[PDB]
Design a protein around this ligand. Structure first.
Ligand SMILES: O=C1CC=CN1c1cccc(NS(=O)(=O)c2cccc(Br)c2)c1
Length: 127
């Protein structure tokens, strides 16, 4: 399509672990953000066709979204929490790259990011 293949959510040869922090990221961090009133644009990969953003994947070369992150967590895709947190960071950063300060979508991302920051502050220690 005008859309690239979505980011993988499984990769059999990638090393992975379950850690208490990754569990936390799924059951609390992801879950909380997912139910937020501003979550909906971020619950799936950007559909450049449907949303009429033909320039999106000209600009964003490392796409990420909470839908991909959710599956990745459900599929135990990650080696550690930092890998997952990086995916969240990429998603926010993409939004701030593609869009303008004060855009509705940026306001939504900003709200989610500050909530994200609160929630990872409460991340349980790891070993
Ligand atoms: O950059 C990202 C990351 C996730 C979605 N987007 C994004 C960015 C620009 C436009 C749109 N299209 S839209 O229909 O979802 C839309 C339009 C106007 C306001 C709001 Br809120 C939402 C989506």
């Amino acid at each position: 399509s005008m859309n690239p293949p979505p980011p993988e959510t499984s990769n059999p040869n990638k090393p992975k672990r379950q850690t208490n922090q990754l569990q936390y990221l799924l059951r609390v961090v992801l879950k909380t953000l997912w139910k937020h009133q501003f979550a909906w644009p971020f619950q799936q990969p950007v559909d450049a066709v449907k949303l009429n953003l033909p320039d999106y994947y000209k600009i964003i070369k490392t796409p990420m979204d909470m839908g991909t992150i959710k599956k990745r967590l459900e599929n135990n895709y990650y080696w550690n929490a930092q890998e997952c947190i990086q995916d969240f960071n990429t998603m926010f950063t993409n939004c701030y790259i593609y869009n303008k300060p004060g855009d509705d979508i940026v306001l939504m991302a900003e709200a989610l990011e500050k909530l994200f920051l609160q929630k990872i502050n409460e991340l349980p220690t790891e070993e």
